[PDB]
């Protein structure tokens, strides 16, 4: 049974939030 | 050396020909001819003048690794 | 799921291929007579591990991926 | 003759004579006793 | 300290540490390393002599 | 190790037969009494003698029909394989100790000369021949020097790098 | 710039100063050795780091020591 | 003794030019000038490649590096027995006199020089690198 | 002023006193060793005569007598080659049947099982098959018996002993003075007219009087034992006139300038003898006669003692122009006072000559049954190519040595050398750009083809059936040389070679020579050759031009020709010396010549060599060069993987020595990388630990063990690299072409 498009968009949004947190940690480690 | 040993002994075991490792690993020409030369025939034919197949990415990466290795020299 | 049904006669798929530099014989060779388009056949053995630990469907793998993304965040 | 024998005593000449003797001894042993694999008679 | 007396070098960074050399001369004007020692072997620079202080050489 | 004696191994006999057959196939292109015919016949005789000697030596053969050596001193002694590794081990160790003791004695003798470096590249050939002949009795002198404490230099007399 | 230090084992043989290609070293008066002079390194901003001075030093171990540090235009030997 | 001043009207050696000379670094960062007084007109080897003819009397050569000037001065002292002076010139026009710094060559001991970089110990008496951790020093040679 | 013999009587006493003192020639090395570096320094400085002394006369005398020693060694080697042909060969049987009998002149002794290398080469004989081509050379000379090979072997050893005598005599008894050696005008006159001219005339005489009638009878089918001996043709003029009827007229046509009567044995046929596949021997006799006359004329150019003639100094000083300053002024003084400049010029031209010889010997094979002996053809091409490349690298080395040691700026002001040094940055930068452009537009074509083929797009490839790169200039040259007997050389019956076009020359069912067509793959590989040669030139020329100074190290000449570095400063100055440029140029020449010999081997196996049957020509690899040599994968598979099957399955046959050497050469090449990739500080510290172990047991040597010097580490690395790679290709080539040829 294949995934749905909404599931992929949900995963992309969660990964975008994770990327925002990654940028925050990278800035905090830099300075 | 370790992974060459693992791969050749298991290749002989998986092909059902245990005697190939037993009768050719005792000398280094056996290693060269019956492991490197013999088992690279399908890999280097991944693309040829007659066409290509699914191993063509591995032939290209094979040459790619040879080139990167040479550039380090 | 197709690998779960036939673990001895199905090659596990790593991910899809989208390469605009591909020619048509490259598209058909990496399709391997399937319907998912050009794919890479996985060598990592994640299919056997995930099958052994009880995952069966694509939904379970997707839920695990979402959970691990949340854990990374 | 002293200088000539001193030249023959230099390290490459002595090495040539010694390795010629050793290689010849091994060759003639393997000629007189062909194919020695074990210490068995 | 004497002339042509065997001494053992106690300087750890010296090439001839724990080795025996011959005293060439001892300077008497109060310089920092007055003992001049000749060694039978050369160091990596091809030098066979070095200067040592009184505490860096032990008579053997 | 699951091996069979080479005197009763079928692979050993098959290998002898195949090698003799190949040499005889090469032999039939030359006339009798010619130099290639005599050389090939001598090779055939050497092949037969070698296979007979390997069978008679009690060598163990694997499934490949080739002799396998036994190097454990226990299995070699209780099954008659000491001539494969153990006796060669004793012979090599004797000759190697001979060579090492002769070299050490030559170095120590040259150390006492006015130009110790001169004897290292211009060999004192009579002295080297005398010292070389005296290396036959190396284990007695070496074991005595080990017991006496004269074999080893003291650690206080050897240079070291700073730690 | 590289750091050049002179240790008190210097015998004042002036060989390091003569070996220097960029005029980093000089001899100053001293009293710790028989030659009554010691090497000094007042111009280490011009030191390229070639270690010709260490090759010229006869003491064991070296009396002149060059420690490669931060690289500038002069220390990298750049004409451009 | 006083430091000499650079005379920019000093004639240059007879040279046909080369590709090994000054670059943009001379205009924007620094360059170097070596002056010497030749006893006679003769051919010398340029440090940047090729043969040049030095004129009798004073000479002036502009070079990209201090090492080039000192190599030329070594050639002049060893081959032609001629002393020389080396200056550093900045793009704003400021001229810094370099060599010989006090008028005496550095290989000859001269009074009035102060030792810099001297350590009052042998090189084996340097401390361990664990003793200079989190101190800001360059190394055990810096303490 | 006056050219004359001047020697010094008994300059050096003949004694064994210095034989007992290694390093006697050197001021530093005569004191004896302190470390193990002295052992290597003694061998490294043994032939650097200019380092031993600054006196040019002593250097010249040493060079002269060393050259006599080299000539004696070469004559010993040649006499041994003739002796092994006389005593340990199947040369007479091969003479009776040169098609089905493989040449062999090495027999191994039966011990430790090595008699398997005595292969069944034919002729009732067992031995190692040889690829040097001596049999075909001896047949072309007219040698028909082992006795004549014995006579040449004995006469060569007598001349070898005369050469060794002359070297002793001209150093220890009558050593010529410096002004004798500096008679370059007399040397050129004697070496052009007397060495080359009289040598070519004497060899034309041998060819006419011996080689032509014996080979004519051999190609007519006469048994070699029934052919009259050469002196029978010398003494009996009627026996000569039976084969060449113009000999009945004697020397009268020569002296009455009726030279066209000699047209039966002085020909201009061109092409190849259809019976033997070699060049016509009458053509070669006319060639050597014409060359002899030309060189005898050329040797009368320079003024020695009778007013007439040219002064080389005047010619050099008169050749100057507006762009070039003083021109060639001062070059005469350089070339009469520096042995290294002369060695650079002569090594460059000799190496280029060796490569030209390789190409001309494959294309126009001058020996009978040479062309159908594919092993010999491949071997002599590859050998002479390698000798040429090594000599060219040596030319770069000794040009750099001249620049460091013998260059004087006082004697070179505004001449060509000075002006070349003064724009070295422009030369090096432009050559660097040319090398980058050539590398991109040659190797990137192969990478593009490999990517296109791997992407399933063969229509986007650079190929004959795709985007074409036709070498149109070379094709036009081939067509011009094919049409030469029509208009531009009407007296030539045939083109110089069958490679220009035309028919297939077949000998014994095998191709001797045939047209070599050039397509896209030939274009690509020729531009690869151009790129690799340009990079090797860049390295060697950069080493020569910056040997004395650079912007990095302005006093590099004071550091010498051969030094490791100038320390870790200025960012790091490893390998700045001109010696290190020679060291890198050796690798690049190896790369270039490896591609050249691979191109030769694949192209002749694919498009020339093969079996001529009734239908046509079936080549060895079946014409797969034009299909697959446009990719790196095609090279690796169809040449390297496919053609190495003979050397890896050679075990148990007479070619098994080639398999062993294949493995051992791979080993030696790999062994070289430990010297090349590492540095001597590690090895010195490891030696310190090992020395501690030896000091503990009182076995530490008095000669203190040191790691190799940095330069020696580089030299050992490059020597083992070259030996391993070249011997790998040697075993692969020889096993492949002996088994399939
Ligand atoms: C220095 C090493 C050396 C030793 C210990 C021997 C030992 C021997 N050789 Mg040998 N040879 C040696 C080097 C060489 N030999 C020979 C050529 C010969 C020949 C031709 C013969 C011997 C023979 C002999 C035997 C009687 C003498 C004896 C076993 C003889 C033999 O084989 O038995 C009587 C005999 O005929 N040798 C050559 C030239 C290739 C050598 C180098
Ligand atoms: C460390 C590696 C190594 C070892 C243990 C051996 C061991 C042996 N080899 Mg092998 N070899 C080895 C490396 C190599 N071999 C060879 C090439 C060969 C060949 C071609 C042959 C051997 C043979 C032999 C045998 C010789 C016995 C003998 O002569 O007794 C003599 C004993 C003495 C001389 C003792 C001294 C007594 C004193 C004079 C009194 C022996 C089994 C021979 C054998 O027939 O195979 C089994 C043989 O024909 N070796 C090469 C390439 C050069 C090597 C590298
Ligand atoms: C590397 C060292 C080494 C190893 C791993 C072995 C291994 C072995 N030995 Mg050997 N040996 C070894 C060195 C030596 N052994 C021997 C003398 C013997 C004897 C006399 C015997 C063994 C036996 C054995 C076997 C059973 C031993 C045991 O512990 O039974 C629990 C086993 C295969 C036995 C046997 O031969 O096989 C069962 C046995 O009887 N060894 C000597 C001489 C002092 C050695 C040195
Ligand atoms: C007098 C000769 C001599 C003796 C008694 C020793 C003894 C020793 N070596 Mg040293 N070596 C000797 C010569 C030489 N060694 C070396 C290079 C090394 C290395 C690199 C190492 C040793 C190590 C060792 C130790 C372990 C045994 C070994 O590894 O052998 C191996 C020996 C070799 C690989 C070289 C042997 C060459 C030859 C067979 C010996 C020389 C013979 C003499 C020329 C004979 C002259 C006598 C005449 C004139 C009467 C042991 C202390 C190892 C170590 O330190 O262990 C703790 C170690 O790693 N040796 C060279 C340069 C190739 C030599 C010449
Ligand atoms: C480039 C020169 C050259 C080379 C590479 C060879 C190579 C060889 N020769 Mg030929 N030769 C050469 C020049 C000459 N040879 C000969 C006359 C011979 C003969 C008569 C024989 C060889 C033999 C051999 C082989 C064995 C040699 C040996 O084992 O020495 C042995 C090593 C020793 C140290 C002993 C030397 C004893 C000698 C009396 C002094 C070897 C392939 C043999 C042959 O080819 O195999 C059947 C052989 O019988 N050579 C002459 C005329 C004098 C030459 C000039
Ligand atoms: C027995 C005859 C004989 C004797 C006693 C001497 C004696 C001497 N020679 Mg004269 N020579 C002799 C014959 C010959 N000489 C010469 C040409 C020269 C030159 C050009 C020079 C001498 C020099 C010397 C002196 C010391 C150098 C030396 O000999 O190292 C011995 C060196 C060897 C034994 C090396 C071996 C070389 C040999 C040609 C083998 C070639 C390689 C092999 C093919 C192996 C390759 C692998 C010494 C006075 C030198 C001098 O006077 O002072 C510096 C000098 O420059 N000789 C030739 C022509 C090559 C000869 C034949
Ligand atoms: C006509 C040819 C020719 C002549 C007369 C010379 C002459 C000279 N060369 Mg030039 N060279 C020549 C051609 C070539 N040169 C060079 C590149 C160089 C360099 C880079 C240097 C010279 C140097 C020298 C000088 C000292 C050489 C010496 O002492 O050898 C000593 C010889 C040895 C120590 C042995 C060399 C062995 C060789 C590296 C490996 C041999 C492998 C074997 C052929 C095959 C395998 C053998 C077996 C045993 C494994 C001398 C002026 C040196 C000098 O300093 O300049 C003044 C120097 O640094 N030459 C190459 C490219 C490789 C040439 C071809
Ligand atoms: C395969 C190994 C190898 C490669 C690729 C190179 C590369 C190069 N060498 Mg080295 N070398 C290599 C082996 C070795 N070289 C040397 C020592 C030297 C010397 C001494 C010199 C060189 C020079 C050169 C350059 C020749 C000019 C050129 O062709 O530019 C074109 C570049 C290539 C042909 C490389 C392949 C590029 C490819 C065709 C295009 C790829 C483009 C990418 C697809 C785009 C990027 C996309 C990515 C980023 C997403 C080039 C940079 C010479 C030089 O620097 O001056 C001109 C020079 O003097 N090499 C040694 C030790 C002896 C080697 C072992
Ligand atoms: C096929 C080979 C590759 C050809 C193209 C490569 C060009 C690479 C070199 C750059 C050109 C630089 C010319 C500067 C050199 C320069 O001084 O030019 C002037 C040069 C000589 O002029 P003069 O009349 O001063 O010469 C008097 C001479 O007797 C003394 O050298 O004449 C040329 O134009 C040479 C021809 C350049 C073409 C070379 C082609 C070789 C065939
Ligand atoms: C391995 C290696 C070494 C170590 C190699 C050494 C010291 C050479 C050893 C050669 C021989 C084997 C040493 C002994 C020579 C004697 C003359 C042999 C006597 C032995 C008898 C049997 C004849 C270096 O010194 C080195 C230096 C610079 C760059 C790379 C390297 C490098 O790679
Ligand atoms: S490293 Fe070089 S530049 Fe620096 S002081 Fe030493 S010699 Fe002078
Ligand atoms: S070379 Fe060394 S000992 Fe001599 S003056 Fe310089 S620092 Fe002192
Ligand atoms: S690494 Fe070696 S070659 Fe490079 S600068 Fe340092 S000492 Fe010189």
C50 in contact with B, Cβ within 8 Å? no
| Contact map slice: A 2-31 vs C, CB within 8 A | 2-3, 7, 10-11, 14-15, 17-18, 21
Quickly tell me which residue has 């003769």 as its tokens.
H42
Q: Which residue of chain D comes nearest to F91, CA vs CA? A: D39
Q: Which residue has the tokens 């540490």?
A: E17
Residue of I616, I639, I617 lying closest to I628 (CA atoms): I639
**Closest chain D residue to the Cα of F51, Cα to Cα:** D35
F50 annotated ligand binder: no
For residues I664, I670, I672 and I673, what is the CA-based torsion angle, rounded to 10 degrees?
Answer: 180
C-alpha–C-alpha distance, residues F58 and F7, integer Å: 8
Neighbours of I628 (CB within 10 A): 25
| Tokens linked to F6 | 């080479």
Angle at which helices F86-111 and F138-148 cross, to 10°: 70
B10 is in an annotated binding site: no
Quote the crossing angle between the two packed helices I339-363 and I374-401, to the nearest 10°: 160
Whole-angstrom Cα distance, residue I393 to residue I355? 13
- How many other CB atoms sit within 10 Å of the CB of residue G18? 15
Question: Among all chains, which residue has been given the structure tokens 């004519």?
Answer: I216
Breaks (C-N over 2.5 A) in chain C follow: none
DSSP H30: -
CB count in 10 Å sphere of residue F158 = 18
What is the crossing angle of helices C58-72 and A5-30, to 10°?
Answer: 20
Assess whether the previous peptide bond of H100 is cis (omega < 30° from 0). Answer: yes
Q: Which residues in chain F are contacts of D14 at CB distance < 8 A?
A: 123, 125, 128
Burial of I719 (0-12, 13-18, 19+ CB in 10 A): middle
Going by beta carbons, is chain G in contact with chain A, meaning 3 or more pairs sit under 8 Å apart? no
CB distance I287 to I212 below 8 Å = no
The tokens describing C40, both together, are: 């890479």
Burial class (CB in 10 A: 0-12, 13-18, 19+), G29: middle
Give every CB contact of residue D15 below 8 A, 6+ residues apart in sequence: none
Q: Which residue of G has its CA nearest to E43?
A: G60
Q: Which of I645, I612, I424 has the alpha carbon at shortest distance from I506?
A: I612
Q: Say if residue G61 is preceded by a cis peptide, omega within 30 of 0.
A: yes
Euclidean distance between CA atoms I527 and I446, whole angstroms: 11
**Helix H or strand E encompassing B64:** helix B56-72
Q: Which two tokens stand for residue G5?
A: 């230090």
Sheet arrangement for strand G3-7: G64-67, G3-7, H118-119
How far apart CA I368 and CA I275 sit, in angstroms, is 8
Give the three-state DSSP class for E3: coil
Strand stretches in chain C, DSSP E: 13-16, 39-41
d(CA I228, CA I209): 12
SS3 of residue E49 by DSSP: strand
CA angle, H50 as apex, H49 and H53 as ends, to 5°?
125
Contact: A14, C69; criterion CB under 8 Å:
yes
Residue F149 region by backbone torsions, left for phi larger than 0, else alpha for psi between -120 and 50, else beta: left
Element (H, E) at F14: helix F10-27
Nearest residue of I to residue B35 by CA position? I648
- Identify the CA nearest to I279 among candidates I372, I368, I208: I368
Q: Give CA–CA dist I625/I627, Å, rounded.
A: 5
Instruction: Give the Å distances, CA to CA, from F14 to E44, F20, I116, I649, I672.
Output: 63, 10, 20, 21, 43
CB pairs under 8 A, 24+ apart, for I262-267?
I265/I208, I265/I212, I266/I208
**CB of E1 within 8 A of CB of E26?**
yes
User: What is the chain I residue with the closest CA to C23?
Assistant: I456
Contact E33, E11 (CB under 8 A): no
Q: How far apart are CA I515 and CA I571, in angstroms?
A: 55
Cβ–ligand 2 contact at D33 (below 6 Å) = no
* C-alpha radius of gyration, chain B, whole number: 14
CB I722 within 8 A of CB I586: yes
HSE-CB for I221 with a 13 A CA cutoff: 0
Rounded CA-CA distance I456/A9 in Å is: 34
The structure tokens 């296979």 sit at F51
Distance of CA F106 from the midpoint of ligand 10 (Å):
22
Residue H38, beta-bridge partner list: H57
The answer to whether residues I357 and I542 touch, using CB atoms and an 8 Å cutoff, is no
Q: How far apart are CA H22 and CA H91, in angstroms?
A: 13
SS3 state at G44: helix
CA of I470 to the centre of ligand 7 (A): 42
Kindly state the tokens that stand for I188: 């050129």
Distance CA(I302)–CA(I296), nearest Å, equals 12
User: Does the CB of D7 have a partner CB in chain I at under 8 Å?
Assistant: yes
CA distances from I594 to H118, I297, I374, I601, I719 (A): 57, 40, 19, 11, 16
What are the CA-CA distances from residue H56 to residues E16, H13, I75, I501, I537 (Å)?
Answer: 55, 9, 60, 70, 41
Task: Specify the residue for token string 């985007």.
Answer: I467
> Do E15 and F160 make contact, defined as CB atoms within 8 angstroms?
no
| Beta bridge partner(s), residue I285 | none
d(CA I703, CA E40): 11
How far is Cα H80 from Cα H86, in angstroms, rounded to an integer? 17
Sheet holding F4-5, edge to edge: F4-5, F60-61, F67-68
Q: Can you tell me the distance from the alpha carbon of I468 to that of G31, in angstroms, rounded to the nearest whole number?
A: 83
- Going by their DSSP bridges, the two strands I119-120 and I174-176 should be labelled as unpaired
Q: Tokens representing I388?
A: 């040429």
**If DSSP codes are grouped into helix, strand and coil, which group holds residue I506?**
strand
Q: D28 CB less than 6 Å from ligand 1?
A: yes
Question: Looking at ligand 3, which atom is closest to the CA of residue F75?
Answer: 36
Closest to I35 measured CA to CA, from I713, I693, I687, I563: I687
What is the enclosing helix (H) or strand (E) of I127? strand I126-129
Tokens 């006492």 belong to residue = F112
Beta bridge partner(s), residue G66 = G4
**CA nearest ligand 2 atom 41, residue:** D37
Nearest beta carbon to residue C73 from set A7, A11, A21? A21
List chain H residues with CB under 8 Å of E12: 124
Establish, for the pair of chains G and I, how many residue pairs have beta carbons separated by less than 8 Å: 35
Query: Dihedral of the CA atoms C54, C56, C59, C60 (nearest 10)?
Result: 10
Work out the angle at residue E30's Cα, subtended by the Cα atoms of residues E25 and E33, and round it to the nearest 5 degrees. 55
Q: Residues E32, E53: contact at Cβ < 8 Å?
A: yes
Centre of ligand 12 to C-alpha G14, Å, is 6
Asked if residue B28 lies in contact with residue I663, where contact means CB atoms within 8 angstroms, the answer is: yes
Q: How far apart are CA I402 and CA I192, in angstroms?
A: 26
- Cα separation of the two ends of chain C: 29
Phi-psi category of residue C54: left, alpha or beta, with phi > 0 → left and psi -120 to 50 → alpha: left
What is the rounded distance in angstroms from the CA atom of residue I119 to the CA atom of residue I134?
A: 19
Nearest to C58 among A2, A11, A18 (CB): A2
Q: Which ligand is in closest contact with the Cα of I328? A: 9
Of I198, I216, I89, I108, nearest to I148 by C-alpha is I89
Report phi then psi at I9, rounded to 5: -85, 125
Nearest to I652 by CA among F48, B25, F19, F40: F19
3-state DSSP assignment of residue I177: coil
Which atom in ligand 5 lies closest to the alpha carbon of residue I157? 55
R_g (Cα) of chain C, nearest Å: 15
Confirm if I277 and I215 have CB atoms less than 8 A apart.
no
- Quick check: F110 and F120 in contact, CB under 8 A? yes
H118-119 and G3-7 beta bridge pairing: parallel
| C13-16 and G3-7 strand pairing | unpaired
G55-80 in b/e burial notation, b at 16+ Cβ within 10 A?
Answer: ebbbbbbbbbbbbbbebeebbebbbe
Q: Checking DSSP bridges between strand H95-99 and strand I119-120, what pairing results, if any?
A: unpaired
User: Nearest CA of chain G to the CA of E51: how many Å?
Assistant: 8
Identify whether the C-beta of residue I326 lies closer than 8 Å to the C-beta of residue I422: no
Question: Residue I452 and residue H6: Cα distance in Å, rounded?
Answer: 66
Please name the helix (run of DSSP H) or strand (run of DSSP E) that holds residue I416, with its range, or none.
helix I416-422
Question: Which residue among I315, I324, I422 is best mutated to probe the pocket of ligand 9, counting the most ligand atoms within 8 A of its Cβ?
Answer: I324
3-class SS string, B22-54: HHHCCCHHHHHHHHHHHHCCCCCCCEECCEECC
How many residues comprise chain D? 41
| Residues in chain G closer than 8 A to H122 (CB atoms) | 7-9, 61
> In sequence order, which residues have a C-beta less than 8 Å from that of residue B50 and are 6 or more positions away?
none
Tokens of H18: 């080369």
H helix or E strand, kind and range, residue F156 = none
Residue I499's DSSP bridge partners are none
Q: How far apart are CA H84 and CA H136, in angstroms?
A: 41
Three-state DSSP class for residue I302: strand
Q: Are H65 and I554 in contact (CB under 8 A)?
A: yes
B–F touching, 3+ CB–CB pairs within 8 Å = yes
Report helix, strand and coil shares of chain F as percent, to nearest 5.
65, 5, 35
Query: Under a CB-based contact definition with an 8 Å cutoff, are residues F67 and F54 in contact?
Result: yes
Give chain G's length.
80
| Residues E21, E52: Cα–Cα separation, whole Å | 11
CB F64 within 8 A of CB B25: no
Give residues with Cβ within 8 angstroms of I407, minimum separation 6. Answer: I417, I548, I557
- DSSP for I202-266 reads HHHHHIIIIIHHHHHHHHTT--TTTSPPHHHHHH-HHHHHHHSGGGGGTTHHHHTT-GGGGGGTS
CA I240/CA I254 separation, integer angstroms: 17
Give residue for tokens 């690869």: I528
In angstroms, what is the span from residue I80 Cα to ligand 5's centroid?
Answer: 8
C22 touches chain B (CB under 8 A): no
Residue I661 contacts by C-beta under 8 Å, 6 or more apart in sequence? Answer: I727, I730, I731
The DSSP line for I59-100 is: HHHHHHHHHHHHHHHHHHHHHHHHHHHHHS--HHHHHH-TTT
Residues 6+ apart with CB under 8 A from F94: F139
Instruction: Decide: I628 and B48 in contact? Cβ < 8 Å.
Output: yes
Euclidean distance between CA atoms F37 and F28, whole angstroms? 8
Contact F44, F27 (CB under 8 A): yes
Helix axes I424-454, B56-72, angle to 10 degrees: 160
φ and ψ of C11, to 5 deg:
-80, 125
Contacts 24+ apart (CB under 8 A), I361-366: I362/I600, I362/I604, I363/I497, I363/I499, I363/I513, I364/I272, I364/I279, I364/I496, I364/I497, I365/I272, I365/I277, I365/I278, I365/I279, I365/I512, I365/I513, I366/I140, I366/I278, I366/I279, I366/I284
CB–CB contacts below 8 A, G to H? 116
The subunits that touch chain G, with at least 3 C-beta pairs less than 8 Å apart, are: E, H, I
Report whether F31 contacts F70 (CB < 8 A). Answer: no
Subunits touching B (CB < 8 Å, at least 3 pairs)?
Answer: C, F, I
Element spanning E7, H or E: strand E6-9
- B to F CB pairs, distance under 8 Å: 6
Kindly state the tokens that stand for A10. Answer: 């949900």
End-to-end CA distance of chain A: 47
Phi-psi region of I108 (alpha: psi -120 to 50; beta: other; left: phi over 0): beta
Write out the two tokens for C33: 């007579």
d(CA C38, CA C30): 5
Phi-psi region at I288: left, alpha or beta (left = phi > 0; alpha = psi -120 to 50): alpha
Token pair of H98 as six digits: 């370099």
Alpha-carbon span I265 to I252, nearest angstrom: 15
3 state SS of D33: coil
* Cα I236 off chain centre by: 41
DSSP letter (8 states) at residue H56: S
For residue I20, which residues of chain F lie inside 8 Å, CB to CB?
A: 122
Chain I window 418-447: which residues touch H at a Cβ cutoff of 8 Å? Answer: 418-419, 421-426
CA-CA distance, H85 to D11, in Å (whole number)?
Answer: 55
Q: Return d(Cα H61, Cα H46) in angstroms, integer.
A: 10
Question: Which of G11, H36, I621 has the alpha carbon at shortest distance from H13?
Answer: H36
Method: cryo-EM
Nearest Cα of chain I lies from the Cα of H20 at a distance, in angstroms, of: 7
């Amino acid at each position: 049974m294949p995934l749905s498009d909404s599931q992929i968009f949900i995963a992309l949004f969660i990964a975008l939030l994770t990327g925002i947190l990654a940028v925050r940690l990278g800035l905090e480690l830099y300075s | 050396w370790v992974t060459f040993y693992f791969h050749w002994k298991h290749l002989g075991i998986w092909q059902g020909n245990v005697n190939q490792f037993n009768e050719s690993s005792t000398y280094l020409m056996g290693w060269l001819r019956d492991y490197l030369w013999l088992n690279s025939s399908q890999l280097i034919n991944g693309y040829n003048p007659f066409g290509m197949n699914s191993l063509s990415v591995w032939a290209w990466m094979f040459l790619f690794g040879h080139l990167i290795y040479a550039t380090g020299f | 799921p197709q690998w779960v049904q036939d673990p001895l006669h199905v090659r596990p798929i790593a991910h899809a291929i989208w390469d605009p530099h591909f020619g048509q014989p490259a598209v058909e060779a990496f399709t391997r007579g399937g319907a998912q388009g050009p794919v890479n056949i996985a060598t990592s053995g994640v299919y056997q591990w995930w099958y052994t630990i009880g995952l069966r469907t694509n939904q379970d793998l997707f839920q695990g991926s979402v959970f691990l993304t949340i854990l990374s965040g | 003759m002293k200088n000539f024998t001193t030249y023959l005593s230099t390290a490459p000449v002595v090495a040539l004579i010694w390795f010629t003797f050793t290689a010849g001894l091994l060759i003639e042993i393997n000629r007189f006793f062909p194919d020695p694999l074990v210490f068995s008679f | 300290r004497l002339w042509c007396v065997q001494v053992k070098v106690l300087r750890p960074e010296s090439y001839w540490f724990n080795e025996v050399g011959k005293v060439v001369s001892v300077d008497q004007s109060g310089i920092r390393y007055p003992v001049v020692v000749r060694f039978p072997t050369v160091n990596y620079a091809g030098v066979s002599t070095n200067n040592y202080s009184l505490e860096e050489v032990q008579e053997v | 190790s699951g091996l069979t004696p080479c005197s009763e191994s079928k692979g050993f006999a098959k290998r002898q037969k195949n090698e003799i057959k190949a040499l005889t196939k090469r032999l039939k292109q030359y006339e009798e009494g010619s130099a290639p015919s005599l050389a090939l016949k001598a090779t055939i005789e050497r092949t037969e003698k070698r296979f007979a000697n390997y069978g008679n030596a009690g060598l163990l053969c694997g499934t490949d029909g080739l002799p396998h050596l036994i190097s454990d001193p226990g299995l070699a002694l209780r099954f008659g394989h000491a001539g494969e590794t153990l006796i060669p081990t004793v012979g090599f160790l004797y000759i190697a100790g001979w060579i090492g003791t002769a070299g050490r004695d030559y170095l120590i003798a040259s150390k006492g000369e006015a130009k110790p470096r001169e004897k290292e590249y211009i060999i004192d050939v009579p002295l080297a021949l005398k010292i070389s002949a005296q290396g036959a009795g190396w284990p007695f002198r070496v074991i005595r020097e080990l017991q006496k404490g004269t074999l080893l230099e003291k650690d206080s007399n050897i240079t070291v790098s700073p730690r | 710039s590289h750091a050049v230090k002179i240790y008190d084992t210097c015998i004042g043989c002036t060989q390091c100063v003569r070996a220097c290609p960029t005029d980093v070293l000089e001899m100053v008066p001293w009293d710790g050795c028989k030659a009554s002079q010691i090497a000094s390194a007042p111009r280490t901003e011009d030191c390229v780091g070639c270690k010709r001075c260490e090759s010229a030093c006869p003491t064991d171990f070296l009396s002149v020591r060059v420690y490669l540090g931060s690289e500038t235009t002069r220390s990298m030997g750049l004409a451009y | 003794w006083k430091p000499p001043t650079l005379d920019p009207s000093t004639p240059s050696p007879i040279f046909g030019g080369s590709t090994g000379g000054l670059l943009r670094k001379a205009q924007i960062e620094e360059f170097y000038v070596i002056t010497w007084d030749a006893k006679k007109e003769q051919v010398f080897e340029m440090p940047t490649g090729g043969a040049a003819i030095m004129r009798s009397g004073p000479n002036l050569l502009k070079l990209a590096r201090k090492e080039q000037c000192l190599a030329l001065l070594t050639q002049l002292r060893n081959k032609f027995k001629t002393d020389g002076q080396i200056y550093r010139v900045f793009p704003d026009g400021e001229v810094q006199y370099l060599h010989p710094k006090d008028g005496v060559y550095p290989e000859k001991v001269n009074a009035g020089r102060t030792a810099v970089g001297a350590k009052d110990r042998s090189i084996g008496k340097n401390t361990n690198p664990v003793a200079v951790k989190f101190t800001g020093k360059l190394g055990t040679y810096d303490v | 002023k006056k050219v004359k013999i001047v020697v010094d009587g008994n300059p050096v006493e003949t004694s064994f006193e210095r034989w007992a003192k290694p390093g006697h020639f050197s001021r530093t090395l005569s004191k004896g060793p302190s470390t193990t570096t002295w052992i290597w320094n003694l061998h490294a400085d043994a032939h650097d005569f200019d380092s031993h002394t600054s006196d040019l006369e002593e250097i010249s005398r040493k060079v002269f007598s060393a050259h006599f020693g080299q000539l004696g060694i070469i004559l010993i080697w040649l006499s041994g080659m003739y002796f092994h042909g006389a005593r340990f060969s199947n040369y007479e049987a091969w003479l009776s049947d040169p098609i089905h009998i493989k040449p062999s002149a090495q027999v191994v002794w039966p011990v430790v099982g090595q008699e398997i290398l005595n292969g069944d080469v034919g002729g009732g004989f067992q031995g190692v098959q040889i690829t040097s081509g001596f049999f075909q050379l001896w047949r072309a000379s007219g040698i028909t018996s082992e006795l004549q090979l014995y006579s040449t072997a004995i006469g060569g050893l007598v001349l070898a002993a005369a050469m060794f005598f002359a070297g002793w005599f001209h150093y220890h008894k009558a050593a010529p003075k410096l002004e004798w050696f500096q008679n370059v005008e007399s040397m050129l006159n004697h070496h052009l007219a007397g060495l080359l001219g009289l040598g070519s005339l004497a060899w034309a005489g041998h060819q006419i009087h011996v080689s032509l009638p014996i080979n004519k009878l051999l190609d007519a089918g006469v048994d070699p034992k029934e052919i009259p001996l050469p002196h029978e043709f010398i003494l009996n003029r009627d026996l000569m006139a039976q084969l060449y009827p113009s000999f009945s007229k004697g020397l009268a046509p020569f002296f009455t300038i009726n030279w066209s009567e000699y047209s039966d044995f002085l020909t201009f046929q061109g092409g190849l003898n259809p019976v033997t596949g070699g060049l016509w021997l009458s053509d070669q006799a006319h060639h050597h006669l014409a060359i002899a006359v030309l060189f005898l004329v050329a040797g009368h150019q320079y003024r020695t003692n009778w007013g007439i003639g040219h002064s080389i100094k005047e010619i050099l000083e008169a050749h100057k122009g507006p762009f070039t300053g003083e021109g060639h002024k001062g070059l005469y003084e350089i070339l009469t006072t520096s042995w290294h400049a002369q060695l650079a010029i002569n090594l460059a031209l000799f190496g280029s000559l060796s490569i030209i010889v390789a190409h001309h010997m494959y294309s126009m094979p001058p020996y009978p049954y040479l062309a159908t002996d594919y092993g010999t053809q491949l071997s002599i091409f590859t050998h002479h190519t390698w000798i040429g490349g090594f000599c060219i690298v040596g030319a770069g080395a000794h040009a750099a040595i001249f620049m460091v040691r013998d260059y004087d700026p006082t004697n070179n002001y505004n001449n060509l050398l000075d002006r070349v040094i003064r724009h070295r940055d422009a030369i090096v930068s432009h050559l660097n750009w040319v090398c980058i452009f050539l590398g991109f537009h040659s190797f990137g074509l192969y990478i593009h083809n490999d990517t296109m083929s791997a992407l399933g797009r063969p229509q986007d490839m650079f190929s004959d059936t795709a985007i074409q790169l036709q070498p149109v200039f070379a094709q036009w040259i081939q067509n011009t040389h094919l049409s030469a007997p029509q208009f531009t050389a009407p007296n030539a019956l045939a083109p110089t070679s069958p490679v220009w076009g035309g028919d297939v020359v077949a000998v014994g069912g095998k191709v001797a020579a045939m047209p070599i067509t050039l397509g896209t793959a030939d274009f690509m590989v020729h531009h690869i050759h151009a790129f690799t040669i340009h990079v090797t030139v860049l390295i060697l020329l950069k080493g020569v031009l910056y040997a004395r100074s650079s912007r990095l190290i302005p006093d590099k000449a004071n550091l010498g020709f051969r030094f490791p570095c100038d320390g870790p400063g200025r960012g790091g100055t490893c390998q700045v010396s001109a010696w290190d440029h020679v060291f890198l140029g050796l690798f690049w020449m190896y790369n270039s010549l490896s591609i050249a010999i691979f191109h030769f081997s694949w192209k002749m196996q694919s498009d020339v060599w093969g079996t001529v049957n009734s239908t046509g020509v079936s080549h060895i690899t079946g014409g797969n060069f034009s299909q697959s040599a446009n990719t790196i994968n095609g090279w690796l598979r169809d040449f390297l993987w496919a053609q190495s099957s003979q050397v890896i399955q050679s075990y148990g046959s007479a070619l098994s020595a080639y398999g062993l050497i294949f493995l051992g050469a791979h080993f030696i090449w790999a062994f070289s990388l430990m010297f090349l990739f590492s540095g001597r500080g590690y090895w010195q510290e490891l030696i310190e630990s090992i020395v501690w172990a030896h000091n503990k047991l009182k076995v530490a040597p008095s000669i203190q063990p040191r790691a190799l010097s940095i330069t020696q580490g580089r030299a050992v690395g490059v020597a083992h690299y070259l030996l391993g790679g070249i011997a790998t290709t040697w075993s692969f080539f020889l096993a492949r072409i002996i088994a399939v040829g």
